[PDB]
Amino acid sequence: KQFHTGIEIKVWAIACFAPQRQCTEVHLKSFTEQLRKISRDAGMPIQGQPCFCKYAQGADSVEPMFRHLKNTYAGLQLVVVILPGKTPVYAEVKRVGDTVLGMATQCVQMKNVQRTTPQTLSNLCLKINVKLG
């Protein structure tokens, strides 16, 4: 519905389910910096430095990674999950986050990490605003 003010995202993680050869460390850093700058300008600042950033492969890797994050990072507010197109990883991410460990997740397509637009960054900011606001 309406846009929420006073969101600060201080503790968040990236779980990259895209293969590193397609979605590289510099894609991740660039995507993050852009998200930092637009979230800042909208008054919902996402700190530039995620507390965790790792590559993973398969739905099977989701629950153990999320258990690890929950057990490791006090005050974790959000996991940003990067998906290489349509994959059962999405449903597992939402099973574990929404209905097992009570962990906010935001999924994003790999193509929107490889190449950002103001518009796709805005889409993401609004989805995140609704989740954490």
Ligand X SMILES: Nc1ncnc2c1nc(Br)n2[C@@H]1O[C@H](COP(=O)(O)O)[C@@H](O)[C@H]1O
Residue ranges in contact with ligand X by CB under 6 A: 83, 86-87, 90, 105-107, 109, 127
Rounded to a whole number of angstroms, the minimum distance from the CB of residue 106 to ligand X is 5
Residues in contact with 39: Cβ distance below 8 Å, sequence separation at least 6, in sequence order: 9, 45, 46, 125, 128
Measured from the CB atom, is 55 or 90 closer to ligand X? 90
Which residue's CB atom is positioned nearest to ligand X? 107
Measured from the CB atom, is 30 or 120 closer to ligand X? 120
Rounded to a whole number of angstroms, the minimum distance from the CB of residue 120 to ligand X is 9
Tokens representing 113 are 């990490």
Question: d(Cα 56, Cα 20) in Å, to the nearest integer?
Answer: 9
φ/ψ of 55, rounded to 5, equals: -90, 150
Rounded to a whole number of angstroms, the minimum distance from the CB of residue 74 to ligand X is 23
Residues in contact with 63: Cβ distance below 8 Å, sequence separation at least 6, in sequence order: 92, 96, 100
Rounded to a whole number of angstroms, the minimum distance from the CB of residue 15 to ligand X is 12
As to burial, measured by CB atoms within 10 angstroms (0-12 exposed, 13-18 middle, 19+ buried), residue 70 is middle
Measured from the CB atom, is 53 or 59 closer to ligand X? 59
Question: d(Cα 114, Cα 27) in Å, to the nearest integer?
Answer: 5
Measured from the CB atom, is 8 or 130 closer to ligand X? 130
